[PDB]
Amino acid sequence: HMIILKLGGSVITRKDSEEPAIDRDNLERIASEIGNASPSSLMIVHGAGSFGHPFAGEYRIGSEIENEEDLRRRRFGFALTQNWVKKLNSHVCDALLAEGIPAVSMQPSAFIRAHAGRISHADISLIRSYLEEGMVPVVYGDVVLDSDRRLKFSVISGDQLINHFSLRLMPERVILGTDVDGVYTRNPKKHPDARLLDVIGSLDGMVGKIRELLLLAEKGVESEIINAAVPGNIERALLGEEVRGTRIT
Amino acid sequence: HMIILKLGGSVITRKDSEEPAIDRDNLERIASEIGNASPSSLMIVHGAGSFGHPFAGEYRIGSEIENEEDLRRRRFGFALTQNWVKKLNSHVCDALLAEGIPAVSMQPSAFIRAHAGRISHADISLIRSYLEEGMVPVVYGDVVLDSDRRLKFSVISGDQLINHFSLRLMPERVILGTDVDGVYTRNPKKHPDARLLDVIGMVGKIRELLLLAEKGVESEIINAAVPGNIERALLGEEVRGTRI
Numbered sequence A: 001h002m003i004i005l006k007l008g009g010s011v012i013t014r015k016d017s018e019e020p021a022i023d024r025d026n027l028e029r030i031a032s033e034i035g036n037a038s039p040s041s042l043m044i045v046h047g048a049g050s051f052g053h054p055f056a057g058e059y060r061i062g063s064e065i066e067n068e069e070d071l072r073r074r075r076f077g078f079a080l081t082q083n084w085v086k087k088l089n090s091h092v093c094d095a096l097l098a099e100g101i102p103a104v105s106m107q108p109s110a111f112i113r114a115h116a117g118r119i120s121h122a123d124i125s126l127i128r129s130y131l132e133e134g135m136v137p138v139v140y141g142d143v144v145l146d147s148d149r150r151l152k153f154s155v156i157s158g159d160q161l162i163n164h165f166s167l168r169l170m171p172e173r174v175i176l177g178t179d180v181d182g183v184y185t186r187n188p189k190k191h192p193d194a195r196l197l198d199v200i201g202s203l204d205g206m207v208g209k210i211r212e213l214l215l216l217a218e219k220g221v222e223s224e225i226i227n228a229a230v231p232g233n234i235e236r237a238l239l240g241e242e243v244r245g246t247r248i249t
Numbered sequence B: 001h002m003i004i005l006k007l008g009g010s011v012i013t014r015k016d017s018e019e020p021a022i023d024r025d026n027l028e029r030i031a032s033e034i035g036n037a038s039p040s041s042l043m044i045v046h047g048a049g050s051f052g053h054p055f056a057g058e059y060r061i062g063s064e065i066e067n068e069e070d071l072r073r074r075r076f077g078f079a080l081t082q083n084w085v086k087k088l089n090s091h092v093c094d095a096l097l098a099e100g101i102p103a104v105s106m107q108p109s110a111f112i113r114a115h116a117g118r119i120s121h122a123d124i125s126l127i128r129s130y131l132e133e134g135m136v137p138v139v140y141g142d143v144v145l146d147s148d149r150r151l152k153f154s155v156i157s158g159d160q161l162i163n164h165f166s167l168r169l170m171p172e173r174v175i176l177g178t179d180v181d182g183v184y185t186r187n188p189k190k191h192p193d194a195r196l197l198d199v200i201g202m203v204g205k206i207r208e209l210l211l212l213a214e215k216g217v218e219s220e221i222i223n224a225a226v227p228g229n230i231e232r233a234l235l236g237e238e239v240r241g242t243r244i
């Protein structure tokens, strides 16, 4: 009766970044909520937010590579980015453990490959054993090697992970905790008449997310998008007591 | 042409605080030495030192489970230990990266399994790829799921890692950077008459290297606490210690 839950990198990281930083209050609270609901089976994915975007964008990870001088620089940037995202994960696991959750991380760059930006290989047997042993596996948006020889590496997002693993683990619920209430007709931060959709079916950042999810819903698994920045929402979603959000179908 | 280098947990960490902590001076120095040597193909293993043993010990990981209280507990500890040793590795990578070294961790507990405390399976195709793209895979001592149902989790040490991967990748040289000058005839730390051996843990450490010795590969023990040994060994130059 398993649940897969994504924590958007925007909810748990802070952008007013001298350096990358946790949103400690959002993080410790969400952990508390995961503890209070105590799901029977759980897997978590989290976005990188300020520990990821800034570095991978600086180095253009996932973009064609023109010359050997590009290449040498990007190879360094892949490594620097992977360490930054690992440090966020270690904060993540700190907060979970602090709440008694046996969070076990699985670094995507150590067992996942991409081809042209799409997950090409992911071992799922180890994740399954962690789940079987009663642990909480935690994956996260990360940089991975890309067998497309123009690219060499890609960023695999929290959202591709949620899609790839929910397809294959066939969880009962897929919950995406984001920093807005749901999907809207329009970017509700640029458009005053954006309306909150309670369910989605086609196209009618956050677009990226929906495209990914629409692949998943089309294979018969539905997800829910809720605001994690709103107290209790994670705890209620994990309890199965409907919350404000959008279902993708 | 490749070299696998271990950095012993005692060398890079210090037992010395309520909190685990790095030996910042050894670690940045060692990073700088690896930087200066610029080996053309390298992989690093490192020990967990004080980020590892304390938690593993508290929870008795890799010893037999009686009770479901025992069980539930060892679970929590597996998770706690893996996080602590991940934070160390993140320090190790910071230090490598500060030297311009494209070091990429590969968390063992994300692709390696054990059986009865021994390394059972590990895909080595991502490691190869990382080496092919000129990066420096960094693995480390960690807790791994163990398919012996009596144990469930084992600590797989940096020594087992160096033995397991050297056999499968067949590196040019293997170099173990420890906190003493070599293997002695006895524990130098409480036998004033222990004599350095120039050719042949270390009850354990040696046990493992012997397996490897036997199957055709020979390693070198050196003191990585001493300035320049790592750099000199990385460059192929005479350095004091023991051949195996």
Ligand SMILES: Nc1ncnc2c1ncn2[C@@H]1O[C@H](COP(=O)(O)OP(=O)(O)O)[C@@H](O)[C@H]1O
Residues within 6 Å of the ligand: A007, A008, A009, A010, A011, A047, A177, A178, A179, A180, A182, A183, A184, A185, A186, A187, A188, A189, A205, A206, A207, A209
């Ligand atoms: N149609 C939309 N509905 C909801 N939010 C949208 C939409 N279009 C753009 N957005 C923006 O997308 C953001 C959420 O996506 P993102 O920053 O990737 O979240 P996460 O950190 O959860 O991945 C929202 O903060 C919002 O500003």
Ligand SMILES: Nc1ncnc2c1ncn2[C@@H]1O[C@H](COP(=O)(O)OP(=O)(O)O)[C@@H](O)[C@H]1O
Residues within 6 Å of the ligand: B007, B008, B009, B010, B011, B047, B177, B178, B179, B180, B182, B183, B184, B185, B186, B187, B188, B189, B201, B202, B203, B205
């Ligand atoms: N016969 C021996 N020769 C050398 N050192 C020994 C011997 N027996 C015990 N030791 C102890 O083992 C220590 C190094 O072992 P180990 O903890 O495996 O190092 P690392 O942290 O580099 O893996 C030495 O500092 C020494 O105190």
